[PDB]
């Protein structure tokens, strides 16, 4: 308000003290908690001067205040961030990653995090200006916690967003991230885990690089972190890795992930966490017979069947895939074990749910079970498929009979196939 002219005059003067005083006043203004007057500061024409001040390497205090003011302008809308970009600040902030002033380096790290954070395009511009390697180079065994937090956050923004950055562009981050997840600091952990969650989201080559960075054992430890801020991205990353092939999935299983994931289903945790854990388990029971056996040995099937029967629909859906996948890849005895743990009833109950994908997955699971029952029938020269009796008793047979009315052709044909094979 009433100070503004002295402030604009200060930044436009050639006097070091007036520049520092004015820039400091603007920095304070831009640091107010709610609705900082970012637009007013831009309109007052001081941004290009702030950007010039970044290059004053004789005057680290002015560089710092100017960097903080610019960080805060770049924390606003996309249009606010675009003004910082248009005035050439990104390459200058990258250069400041090599400043001998610790405060300035940290501020430059923060500023670049805010720019990268705006969108995939701004992230790509930051990476294109070579920010990654100098960001990493000034990290080491001696780095202040305040710097570790800022750099890890910025790193996570360099990795964030769809479409994803090139894997070649973010690869140098993997070894730093693999070290950072050994911090005990929750903030560093939170951001490093988000970053790994982004880098592991994609094709099996991306997952391979993440695994080769050596993170699996520690990611699995962090499944037990008491803070949801850490647990959630750790769990997301673990989930991403087991979308990969059998050997990649085995790298997670080999570090007692399954007992950890089970404890997430049995603690009193938010629905979205349990849903994530069931999805992850589902991608594990989609694996080979040894991996199914590991899920069994961990004691997961009982809890999983209870969820399938009684949980909120979002969780039930993942439990369904999880049980159905196990019936698809499992051996005869593994399948009998799922039946002895009570899976038939809940699979039957879901034949009437409004989601056709789930109806199909339940039907397929029941079909796999029926085949097993029929093999037992043959081997005992028996009269009855025991599992078809069970499906009948769970009121699954009448539900299958009504699926002959279903719109969906795949469901219809499957139902007919099942009825003709086991009830003719």
């Amino acid at each position: 308000g009433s100070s503004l002219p002295a402030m604009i005059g200060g930044v436009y003067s050639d006097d070091n003290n007036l520049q520092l005083e004015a820039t400091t006043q603007f920095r304070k203004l831009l640091s107010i908690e709610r609705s900082p007057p970012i637009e007013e500061v831009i309109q007052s024409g001081v941004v290009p001067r702030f950007v010039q001040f970044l290059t004053r390497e004789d005057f680290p205090q002015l560089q710092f205040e100017a960097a903080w003011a610019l960080t805060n302008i770049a924390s606003g809308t996309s249009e606010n961030t675009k003004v910082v970009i248009d005035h050439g600040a990104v390459p200058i902030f990258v250069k400041l990653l090599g400043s001998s002033s610790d405060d300035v380096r940290e501020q430059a790290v923060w500023a670049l995090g805010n720019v990268a954070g705006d969108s995939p395009k701004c992230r790509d511009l930051v990476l294109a200006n070579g920010a990654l390697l100098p960001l990493l180079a000034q990290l080491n065994e001696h780095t202040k916690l305040s710097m570790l937090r800022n750099a890890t956050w910025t790193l996570s923004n360099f990795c964030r967003g769809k479409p994803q950055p090139s894997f070649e562009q973010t690869r140098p981050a993997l070894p730093a991230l693999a070290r950072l997840i050994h911090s005990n600091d929750e903030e560093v952990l939170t951001d490093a885990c988000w970053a790994l969650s982004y880098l592991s989201d994609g094709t099996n080559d991306k997952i391979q690089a993440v695994i080769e960075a050596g993170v699996c054992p520690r990611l699995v430890e962090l499944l037990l972190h008491p803070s949801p801020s850490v647990l959630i991205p750790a769990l997301r990353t673990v989930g991403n890795i087991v979308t990969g092939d059998d050997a990649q999935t085995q790298c997670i299983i080999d570090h007692q992930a399954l007992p950890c994931l089970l404890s997430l289903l049995t603690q009193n945790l938010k629905k979205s966490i349990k849903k994530e854990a069931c999805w992850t388990i589902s991608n594990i029971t989609a694996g080979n017979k040894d991996q199914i056996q590991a899920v069994i040995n961990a004691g997961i099937i009982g809890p999983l069947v209870n969820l399938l029967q009684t949980a909120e629909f979002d969780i039930k859906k993942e439990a369904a895939w999880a049980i159905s996948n196990a019936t698809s890849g499992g051996s005869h005895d593994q399948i009998k074990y799922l039946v002895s743990e009570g899976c038939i009833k809940p699979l039957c109950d879901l034949l009437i749910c409004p989601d056709i994908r789930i109806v199909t997955v339940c039907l397929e699971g029941l079909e796999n079970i029926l085949k097993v029952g029929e093999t037992d029938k043959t081997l005992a020269a028996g009269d009855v498929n025991v599992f078809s009796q069970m499906i009948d008793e769970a009121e699954g047979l009448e539900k299958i009979e009504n699926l002959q009315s279903h719109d969906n052709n795949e469901i219809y044909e499957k139902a007919v196939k099942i009825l003709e094979a086991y009830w003719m």
Partner: peptide, 14 residues
Amino acid sequence: LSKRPRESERKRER
């Protein structure tokens, strides 16, 4: 069984 793939601004003022 079958593997199933995974089912904005992020800024900080100082």
